[PDB]
C-alpha cells in the first residue's frame, strides 16, 4: 500500500504541526472495517506508544506525554489519515507512524515521519 508522508517534518516550537498522511487504496473506505493506528517512538529501536486509533470511530488515547494537544485532522473516506499536534513542544521530537488497513485490501500501509522541533 502506497502511503505518502514527509520523511522529515520540521516545525517551530509552539506552532501547530500537521502530520500529513494519505494512502492510495483503490477499495472504498468502509468505516466498519477500516483500521488506523498512529503510534509514536523516540528512536528506531525504541518503544512505540499508540496515541490515536480508528476503530469504528476516532479513539484518542489521550497519552499523558501529549496532554490534549493531539487531534485527528484527516478524512478516511478521502484517503487522508493526517493528525494535528497543537502547540508543539520540544519533547514532541521523535518518530510518528501511520499504520493503515483497508479491508479487503490485503496489504497494510505504514508511513513514518521524523518530527524535528526548531527553536
Amino acid at each position: 500500500m502506497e502511503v505518502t508522508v514527509p520523511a522529515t517534518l520540521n516545525v517551530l516550537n509552539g506552532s501547530d504541526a500537521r502530520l500529513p498522511c494519505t494512502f492510495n487504496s483503490c477499495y472504498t473506505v468502509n468505516h466498519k472495517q477500516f483500521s488506523l493506528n498512529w503510534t509514536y517512538q523516540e528512536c528506531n529501536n525504541c518503544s512505540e506508544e499508540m496515541f490515536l486509533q480508528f476503530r469504528m470511530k476516532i479513539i484518542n488515547l489521550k497519552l499523558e506525554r501529549f496532554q490534549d494537544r493531539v487531534e485527528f485532522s484527516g478524512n478516511p473516506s478521502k484517503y487522508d489519515v493526517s493528525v494535528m499536534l497543537r502547540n508543539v513542544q520540544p519533547e514532541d521530537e521523535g518518530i510518528y507512524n501511520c499504520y493503515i488497513m483497508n479491508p479487503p485490501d490485503r496489504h497494510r500501509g505504514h508511513g513514518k515521519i521524523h518530527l524535528q522541533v526548531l527553536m
Binding site: C26, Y27, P104, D105, R106
Partner: protein, 1417 residues
C-alpha cells in the same frame, strides 16, 4: 544519361543559384522513377567507384532548377536532400556533413537500428525489470539520439524541402526522443502513462522495414472508403437503441423481494441500509452460484419467482451494473454488443426473463437487420476497396514491366557406381510411391487408436507398430539417400522435410528422450502432407499457407506488430490495477483466469478480442481501471485489429483463389505415379480377367388408358395441388400440440388422433392417384416422390401397427418419432424453397471434398491433443460447491477415492467433452473452433499435471499455444479455403444457367426488375407554379433549400431530445420533454400544412412526401391516444408500444444522405432471396423443433435449460433453436444431454402428471442433433452472406453518368431532317457515311467513319435501308457503353415506338451491316 554522374560541387551550386536568379527575374512534375526511395534505373549502368556514396547533382530535370543534390548508395538507392546549409551552418561540401551523409545511407544504417529496436521490444515485455534495464534504457535513448542527430546533420531541421521534420515518421521518432529526454531528465511523476509513451518506440519498426509503409498506406485507404458504412452503422445502432430504451427502460432492475419483512421494514429503508453480497442474498432471491439476482417479471410469459417473493423494480443492474437499457449510452453499448454477437445469448435471456417472451420478436429483427446485414455491408465495402486497389496495383506493375521490356529492346537495337545405378533402377517410382503412401496412411490410422483406459497389450502393440513404421521410413530415406546423389537428395525440399522427420524420430529412439513425446508425435504426423502431390485441395491449402507467409508476409508481420503493441500497452496501463484491485473482480483475491498483469496473459486477452469475445474481460477491466480508458483501449483494439484481420483474410482469399490468374503451367510432364500405377494395374487385371475367363471356358384396354388420362387430369389440376398443400400445412401444424401439457387438453388430444387418421388416408389416396396417372417408372425416377413415398409408408406402418394392437413393441415407439419429417413434404410444393434446395445440392460435391481436407487437418490436430491430454482432465471436485480441491491435499486419484470413502460429496469427475479419444477430440475441436465452450476445455488443458494426478493451477501454462496454433490453422485457414471454393463453385453455377440469379423464382425475377427500375428513373416533370401572387410567393418560400435544411436540423434536434430520457428522471424533466415533443409535433404538422397549401394536390407524388404525411398522422394519433390511454384506460405495455411511433420522424433523416440511401436500396433489392432462404431456414427450424421436443422434453435442468428456454413446448423449443442458429450457446444446451448414467442422471424418475420416466438423454442422438443443426445453419447463413454480397456488388456498380442532354437528342433530329425531308424514318446505308459526319460531338463520328459504322452492327431493312432508332441506339451506346440502364432505355424507347406506329410489316430486318460486309467480301 547512362554516363550522367557528376560530383555535386561549388560550381554546380553556383550554376543552380545563377539559373534560379534568372528564373526569379522573369516572373511539370518529378520523374517518379528518379524519385527518392526508389531504385536507380539500369539505364545508367554501374556506378563509378568514386561517385557512389557522395553528393551528386540532381538527375531529374524537374529539380535540376531548384537547389538540390542526390546521393546513391551501393544498392542503387536514390536519396534526395537540399543544397541549402542546414540551419545556415553546414554547406553540403563540408567534411562533417559529408561524413554524416556517408553514415546515414548505409546498409549497416538500418540493420543497426533494427536490432536495437527489437532488443528494446524484447525489453518492454518485462513485468518487474531488474536494474540492468536502467543502463539499457539509457543506452537505448543514446542510440536513438545518435541516429536522430545523424539524420538532422545531413538533412536539416526544417529550413528547406528535404528536411528532417518533413517526413511524418520523423515526427514520430522526434516526439519519441523528446518524451524520452523529458521523462529521464525532469522525472515528474505518474510514470505509468509516461512509460506507456515509450511503447511508440515499437512503432519505429514500421519505419526501418522496406515493405511496412506501403501496407499501412493501403490500410488507411481501405479505411477512408468506409465513411458511409460507418455513418449507417451509427445511425442504425442509435435508432435501435432508442427502440430498446423505450421498450426496456428499467426492466433489468427487476429482482424479486421477500414478501414478509420483519420489524417494521420496507423496501426503501432496506435498499438504503444494505451493502454486501450476503446481505443482498438475505432479502432478494439469488440463484445458487450467481452474483446477480433472479430477474422476475410482471407479465405471465416472464420469469416466475418463488412463492414468498414479489417482483419489484429496485436496485442495480446485473454485470456489476454494466448491462441495462436505462440510458442511451448503456443502450448503445448493449446494442453494439448485440451487433457483434458477443455473448448476446445472455442479454437475450435476461431481457426475455424480465420483459415477456413476446419481446423476442425485437431480438429477431435486431439480430437480422443489425448483425447479419451490417456486417455483410462492411465485408462487401472492404472487399470492393481491396479488390480494386489490388487490381490497379497489378495493372500498374504490368505496365511498368512492359515499359522496362520496351526499353531493353531499344537498348538492344567402382562398386559404388554399380550398386548406385542398380538401386536407382530399383527406386521404382511407379510403385514405391504407392507403397510408401499407403504406409503413411496406415501409420496415421495406427496412431489414432490411443484412448485413456488402455491395456498393456494394446500399449506394446502400438510400440511395435511405431517401431516398424519408423524402420520403414528410415529405410526408404537411406535408400533414396544413396540412390540419388546425397547432394541431389538433399536438394529437394520434400526430401529435406522427410529427412528432418526421420532424423527426429531416430533421435527419439536412441537416448532417453521419451519426455518430449509431443515433438515425436507431431513430426511423424506432419508427414501426411506428402499426399499433396496427388490431391488438389490439400495442395490448395498448402498454397494458402505459403501465400500468407511468403507473398503477403509483410501484412502478417504488420498484424504481429500491432498485436504485440496492443499487448504491451495493455500490460502497462492495466497491469498494476489487476493486482491492486483484485478482490473487486474475484472473491478469492487472486488474479482471474484472464488478466493483463504480465505479457503472456495480456497477449491472450488481445487474441480473445481478435476472436470476437470482448465483453467479459472488459467488465473486469472497467471494474479495476475505470470506464474511460478501458473503453478506449478495447474499442481501438476491436476496430483496428478486426480491420487488419479482415484485410489479411481477404488478401489471402483473392491472391490464393486467383487460379485463373495463376494458370500458366505447360503440359503435365508426369501425371502422378498414382495415375501411372492405376493404368498399369488396370492393364494387369484386365489381362488376368481375360486369361481366367479363358480357363473358365476351358474347364466347363381402352378403359385402362382412359382411367390413366383421367387420373392425370385430376392430379395435375390447381384445385388438387392447393388442397394437398392445405392438408400438408394442417398436418404439420398438428404436430405443434403434443407438448408436455397435452394431458391438460384431452379433447384436442382425441381430435388430433382422428385427424392423423384422416391425414394418413388422404395422403395414401393421393399417392395411389399419382401412381395411376404418372406411372410406376416416372413416379420412382424422382427425388421428391421418393420422399413422399417414404413418409407415407412410415405413417402407414405406424397406423397398421397401432390398429392391429402390437404397439409399444421396441422400435415401433421410435418410428413414431419420425412423424417430425412430415413438414419435409412441403419442399416439393413451394418453388421458393425448391430453388435454394436445388442450389444447396449443387454445392454438395464441392463442399464434400473440402470437408474431407478439413477432417484430415483436424485429425492431425486431434491426434496431437490426444497425445497431450489423454485422460488428464479428471478432478476431485466437491459436488456441493462444484469446486476443485486444493490439490495440496488429494494429489492423486487414490487420495480422491480415500476421501470419497470418508466424506460424502466428492467425485472423481471427468470433463464431459475431453480429449480421451479421437471422437471426443473432434467434438472438443469443434467447440474450440466455434469459440463456444472453448474456455472450459482450455482451463483444464492448461491445468493438467498427469494421467491420475490432480490438476494444478496453470501447470501447463503454455498449452494455450496449442489452441492458438489450432485456431490459426483450423478455424482461420480452413475457413479461408472454404469460402474460396464456395465462391468459385457459385460463380460456376451462376455461369452455368447463363448468368442469372440462383435464389429467386421466375415470378420474383420480374418483381426484382421492376423494383430495379425504381432506382434512378431520371425523366423529370416540374411541379406547377401557383397562379396566385400570394400563394405563389409563399410557394417560392416553401420550395427553397433553406426550408429543407431547417426541417432536417429540427429532425436532428428531435432525436437529441429523445436521447436524453433516462430511468428515474424527475417530474420536471418529464414535463419539459413532453412539451418539447408537443412543439416538435406542431412544427412538423405545420410544415406539412404549409406545403399542402403551396403545393396543392401535387404533394402526393413524391413517395417521401407520402411517408412524411403518414409519419405526421401516426405521431399525432400516438400523442392523443396516449393522452386518452392515461386518464381512461390502464395498460403499461401498450402505452410504450404506442409511443414508439415518434421514432417515425427520425427516419426522415434518410431523405438527406444520398449515401445511406444507396445502401438501403441494395438491402431492399436483396429481400426476395433472403425471404426464400428464410423460409427454408424456418422449415428446418420447425422439423428440428419437433424432434427436439420429442426427444429432450424430459432432460435435467442443468445449464442452458432453465424453467424457460427448454424443449417442453413448441415456443420454448423455437426460442432455443433461434438462439443457437447463430451457434451461440449450443455447448450449453448439449451439456445436459450428455448425462446418461448415475449419478449424472436418474433413469427411474417419475414425472408428476405423465408416464415417461428417465430424466436423461441419449448422448448419440443429442450429439448428432446439435452438430448437424449447427452445420446446416452455417451452410444457410453462408448462402445468405453470398446473396447479400452479390446484390451489393451489383447495386454499387449499376449506374453510369448518361450525360447526353435533351439538346443532343434534338440535334440528332435536326441533322436527320436534312437527309429525310419526307419523314420516312428510313435512311440509305450510303447516306449513313455522311450522316455520322454531320453530327456535333459527342455523337460526332469522323471520317473515315465506315470502319466504326460497320462494327456497330446496325440492322438493315429491305432495300438496304436503316431505321432511325437503330442509328440512335448505336450512337448512344458508343458514348455511354454497356450499362444496366442501356437495356432498359432500349426497352422504353421501343415500346413508345410500338404504340405510335402499328405498321410492323415494314420493320423486319433482312441483314446487318457486319453480316452485309461479310457477304460483300
Amino acid at each position: 544519361g547512362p554516363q550522367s554522374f557528376v560530383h555535386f560541387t561549388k560550381q554546380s551550386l553556383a550554376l543552380i543559384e545563377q539559373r534560379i536568379a534568372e528564373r526569379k527575374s522573369k516572373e511539370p512534375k518529378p520523374s517518379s522513377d528518379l524519385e527518392a526511395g526508389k531504385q536507380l534505373p539500369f539505364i545508367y549502368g554501374d556506378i563509378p567507384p568514386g561517385m557512389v556514396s557522395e553528393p551528386l547533382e540532381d538527375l531529374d530535370p524537374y529539380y535540376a532548377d531548384k537547389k538540390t543534390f542526390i546521393v546513391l548508395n551501393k544498392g542503387k538507392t536514390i536519396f534526395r536532400f537540399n543544397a541549402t546549409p542546414a540551419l545556415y551552418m553546414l554547406s553540403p561540401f563540408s567534411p562533417l556533413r559529408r561524413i554524416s551523409i556517408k553514415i546515414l545511407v548505409h546498409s549497416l544504417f538500418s540493420m543497426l537500428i533494427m536490432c536495437t529496436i527489437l532488443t528494446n521490444c524484447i525489453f518492454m515485455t518485462m513485468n518487474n525489470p531488474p536494474d540492468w534495464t536502467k543502463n539499457v534504457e539509457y543506452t537505448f535513448t543514446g542510440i536513438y539520439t545518435f541516429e536522430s542527430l545523424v539524420k538532422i546533420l545531413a538533412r536539416g531541421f526544417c529550413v528547406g524541402e528535404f528536411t528532417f521534420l518533413r517526413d511524418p515518421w520523423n515526427w514520430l521518432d522526434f516526439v519519441v526522443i523528446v518524451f524520452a529526454y523529458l521523462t529521464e531528465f525532469v522525472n515528474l511523476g505518474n510514470v505509468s502513462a509516461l512509460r506507456t509513451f515509450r511503447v511508440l518506440r515499437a512503432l519505429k519498426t514500421i519505419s526501418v522495414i522496406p515493405g511496412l509503409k506501403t501496407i499501412v498506406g493501403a490500410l488507411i485507404q481501405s479505411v477512408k472508403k468506409l465513411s458511409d458504412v460507418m455513418i449507417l452503422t451509427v445511425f442504425c445502432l442509435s435508432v435501435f437503441a432508442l427502440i430498446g430504451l423505450q421498450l426496456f427502460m428499467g426492466n433489468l432492475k427487476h429482482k424479486c423481494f421477500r414478501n414478509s419483512l420483519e420489524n417494521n421494514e420496507t423496501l426503501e429503508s432496506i435498499m438504503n441500509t444494505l451493502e454486501s453480497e450476503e446481505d443482498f442474498r438475505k432479502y432478494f432471491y439469488y440463484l445458487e452460484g450467481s452474483k446477480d439476482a433472479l430477474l422476475c417479471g410482471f407479465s405471465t410469459d416472464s420469469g416466475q419467482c418463488p412463492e414468498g417473493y414479489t417482483c419489484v423494480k429496485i436496485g442495480r443492474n446485473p454485470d456489476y451494473g454494466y448491462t441495462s437499457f436505462d440510458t442511451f449510452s448503456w443502450a448503445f453499448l448493449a446494442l453494439f454488443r448485440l451487433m457483434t454477437q458477443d455473448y448476446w445469448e445472455n442479454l437475450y435471456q435476461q431481457t426475455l426473463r424480465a420483459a415477456g417472451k413476446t419481446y423476442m420478436i425485437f431480438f429477431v429483427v435486431v439480430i437480422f437487420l443489425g448483425s447479419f446485414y451490417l456486417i455483410n455491408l462492411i465485408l462487401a465495402v472492404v472487399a470492393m476497396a481491396y479488390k480494386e486497389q489490388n487490381q490497379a496495383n497489378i495493372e500498374e506493375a504490368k505496365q511498368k514491366e512492359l515499359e522496362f521490356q520496351q526499353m531493353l529492346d531499344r537498348l538492344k537495337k567402382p562398386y559404388w557406381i554399380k550398386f548406385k545405378k542398380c538401386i536407382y533402377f530399383i527406386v521404382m517410382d511407379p510403385f514405391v510411391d504407392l507403397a510408401i503412401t499407403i504406409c503413411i496412411v496406415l501409420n496415421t490410422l495406427f496412431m489414432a487408436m490411443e484412448h485413456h483406459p488402455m491395456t498393456e497389450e494394446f500399449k506394446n502393440v502400438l510400440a511395435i507398430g511405431n517401431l516398424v513404421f519408423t524402420g520403414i521410413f528410415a529405410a526408404e530415406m537411406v535408400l533414396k539417400l544413396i540412390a540419388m546423389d546425397p547432394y541431389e537428395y538433399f536438394q529437394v525440399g520434400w526430401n529435406i522435410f522427410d529427412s528432418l522427420i526421420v532424423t527426429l524420430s531416430l533421435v527419439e529412439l536412441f537416448l532417453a528422450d521419451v519426455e518430449g513425446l509431443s515433438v515425436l508425435r507431431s513430426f511423424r504426423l506432419l508427414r501426411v502432407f506428402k499426399l499433396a502431390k496427388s490431391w488438389p485441395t490439400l495442395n490448395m491449402l498448402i498454397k494458402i499457407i505459403g501465400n500468407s507467409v511468403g507473398a503477403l508476409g509483410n501484412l502478417t508481420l504488420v498484424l504481429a506488430i500491432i498485436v504485440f503493441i496492443f499487448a504491451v500497452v495493455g500490460m502497462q496501463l492495466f497491469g498494476k490495477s489487476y493486482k491492486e484491485c483484485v478482490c473487486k473482480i474475484n472473491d478469492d483475491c487472486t488474479l482471474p483466469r484472464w488478466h493483463m498483469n504480465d505479457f503472456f496473459h495480456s497477449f491472450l486477452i488481445v487474441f480473445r478480442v481478435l476472436c470476437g469475445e470482448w465483453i467479459e474481460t472488459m467488465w473486469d477491466c472497467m471494474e479495476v481501471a475505470g470506464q474511460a480508458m478501458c473503453l478506449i483501449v478495447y474499442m481501438m483494439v476491436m476496430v483496428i485489429g478486426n480491420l487488419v484481420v479482415l484485410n489479411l483474410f481477404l488478401a489471402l482469399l483473392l491472391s490464393s483463389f486467383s487460379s485463373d490468374n495463376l494458370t500458366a503451367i505447360e503440359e503435365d510432364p508426369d501425371a502422378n505415379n498414382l495415375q501411372i500405377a492405376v493404368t498399369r494395374i488396370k492393364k494387369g487385371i484386365n489381362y488376368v480377367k481375360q486369361t481366367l475367363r479363358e480357363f473358365i471356358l476351358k474347364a466347363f384396354g381402352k378403359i385402362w388408358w382412359n382411367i390413366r388420362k383421367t387420373c392425370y387430369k385430376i392430379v395435375e389440376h390447381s384445385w388438387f395441388e392447393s388442397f394437398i398443400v392445405l392438408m400438408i400445412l394442417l398436418s404439420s401444424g398438428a404436430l405443434a400440440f403434443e407438448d408436455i401439457y397435452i394431458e391438460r387438453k384431452k379433447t384436442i388430444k382425441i381430435i388430433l388422433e382422428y385427424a392423423d387418421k384422416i391425414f394418413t388416408y388422404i395422403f395414401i389416396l393421393e399417392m395411389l392417384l399419382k401412381w395411376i396417372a404418372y406411372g410406376y417408372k416416372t413416379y420412382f425416377t424422382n427425388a421428391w416422390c421418393w420422399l413422399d413415398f417414404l413418409i407415407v409408408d412410415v405413417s402407414l406402418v405406424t397406423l397398421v401397427a397401432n390398429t392391429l394392437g402390437y404397439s409399444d413393441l421396441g422400435p415401433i415407439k421410435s418410428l413414431r418419432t419420425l412423424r417430425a419429417l412430415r413438414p419435409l413434404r412441403a419442399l416439393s410444393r413451394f418453388e421458393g424453397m425448391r430453388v435454394v434446395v436445388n442450389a444447396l445440392i449443387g454445392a454438395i460435391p464441392s463442399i464434400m471434398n473440402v470437408l474431407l481436407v478439413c477432417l484430415i487437418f483436424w485429425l492431425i490436430f486431434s491426434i496431437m491433443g490426444v497425445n497431450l491430454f489423454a485422460g488428464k482432465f479428471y478432478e476431485c471436485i466437491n459436488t456441493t460447491d462444484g469446486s476443485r480441491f486444493p490439490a495440496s491435499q488429494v494429489p492423486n486419484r487414490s487420495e480422491c477415492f480415500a476421501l470419497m470413502n470418508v466424506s460424502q460429496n466428492v467425485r472423481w469427475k471427468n470433463l464431459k467433452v475431453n480429449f480421451d479419444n479421437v471422437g471426443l477430440g473432434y467434438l472438443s475441436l469443434l467447440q474450440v473452433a466455434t469459440f463456444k465452450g472453448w474456455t472450459i476445455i482450455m482451463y483444464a488443458a492448461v491445468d493438467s499435471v498427469n494421467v491420475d494426478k490432480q490438476p494444478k493451477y496453470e501447470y501447463s501454462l503454455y498449452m494455450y499455444i496449442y489452441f492458438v496454433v489450432f485456431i490459426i490453422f483450423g478455424s482461420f485457414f480452413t475457413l479461408n479455403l472454404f469460402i474460396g471454393v464456395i465462391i468459385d463453385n457459385f460463380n460456376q453455377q451462376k455461369k452455368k444457367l447463363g448468368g442469372q440469379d440462383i435464389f429467386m423464382t421466375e415470378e420474383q425475377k420480374k418483381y426484382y426488375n421492376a423494383m430495379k427500375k425504381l432506382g434512378s428513373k431520371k425523366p423529370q416533370k416540374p411541379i406547377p407554379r401557383p397562379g396566385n401572387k400570394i400563394q405563389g410567393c409563399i410557394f417560392d418560400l416553401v420550395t427553397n433549400q433553406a426550408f429543407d435544411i431547417s426541417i432536417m436540423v429540427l429532425i436532428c434536434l428531435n432525436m437529441v431530445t429523445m436521447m436524453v430520457e433516462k430511468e428515474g428522471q424527475s417530474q420536471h424533466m418529464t414535463e419539459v420533454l413532453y412539451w418539447i415533443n408537443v412543439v416538435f409535433i406542431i412544427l412538423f404538422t405545420g410544415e406539412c400544412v404549409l406545403k399542402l397549401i403551396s403545393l396543392r394536390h401535387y404533394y402526393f407524388t413524391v413517395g417521401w412526401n407520402i411517408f412524411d404525411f403518414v409519419v405526421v398522422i401516426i405521431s399525432i394519433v400516438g400523442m392523443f391516444l396516449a393522452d386518452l390511454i392515461e386518464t381512461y384506460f390502464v395498460s403499461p405495455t401498450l402505452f410504450r408500444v404506442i409511443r414508439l411511433a415518434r421514432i417515425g420522424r427520425i427516419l426522415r433523416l434518410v431523405k438527406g444522405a444520398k449515401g445511406i440511401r444507396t445502401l438501403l436500396f441494395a438491402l431492399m433489392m436483396s429481400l426476395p432471396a433472403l425471404f426464400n432462404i428464410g423460409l427454408l431456414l424456418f422449415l428446418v427450424m420447425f422439423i428440428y423443433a419437433i424432434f427436439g421436443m420429442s426427444n429432450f422434453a424430459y432432460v435435467k435442468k442443468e445449464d442452458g435449460i432453465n424453467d424457460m428456454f427448454n424443449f417442453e413446448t413448441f415456443g420454448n423449443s423455437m426460442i432455443c433453436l433461434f438462439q443457437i442458429t447463430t451457434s451461440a450457446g449450443w455447448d450449453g444446451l448439449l451439456a445436459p444431454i450428455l448425462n446418461s448414467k448415475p449419478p449424472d442422471c436418474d433413469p427411474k424418475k417419475v414425472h408428476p402428471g405423465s408416464s415417461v420416466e428417465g430424466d436423461c438423454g441419449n448422448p448419440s442422438v443429442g450429439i448428432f442433433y446439435f452438430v448437424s443443426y449447427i452445420i446446416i445453419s452455417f451452410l444457410v447463413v453462408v448462402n445468405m452472406y453470398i446473396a447479400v454480397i452479390l446484390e451489393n456488388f451489383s447495386v454499387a456498380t449499376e449506374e453510369s453518368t448518361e450525360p447526353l442532354s435533351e439538346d443532343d437528342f434534338e440535334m440528332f433530329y435536326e441533322v436527320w431532317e436534312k437527309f429525310d425531308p419526307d419523314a420516312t424514318q428510313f435512311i440509305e446505308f450510303s447516306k449513313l457515311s455522311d450522316f455520322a459526319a454531320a453530327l456535333d460531338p459527342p455523337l460526332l463520328i469522323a471520317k473515315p467513319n465506315k470502319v466504326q459504322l460497320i462494327a456497330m452492327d446496325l440492322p438493315m431493312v429491305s432495300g438496304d435501308r436503316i431505321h432511325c432508332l437503330d442509328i440512335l441506339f448505336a450512337f448512344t451506346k458508343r458514348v455511354l457503353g454497356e450499362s444496366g440502364e442501356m437495356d432498359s432505355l432500349r426497352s422504353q424507347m421501343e415500346e413508345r415506338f410500338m404504340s405510335a406506329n402499328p405498321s410492323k410489316v415494314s420493320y423486319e430486318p433482312i441483314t446487318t451491316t457486319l453480316k452485309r460486309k461479310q457477304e460483300d467480301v
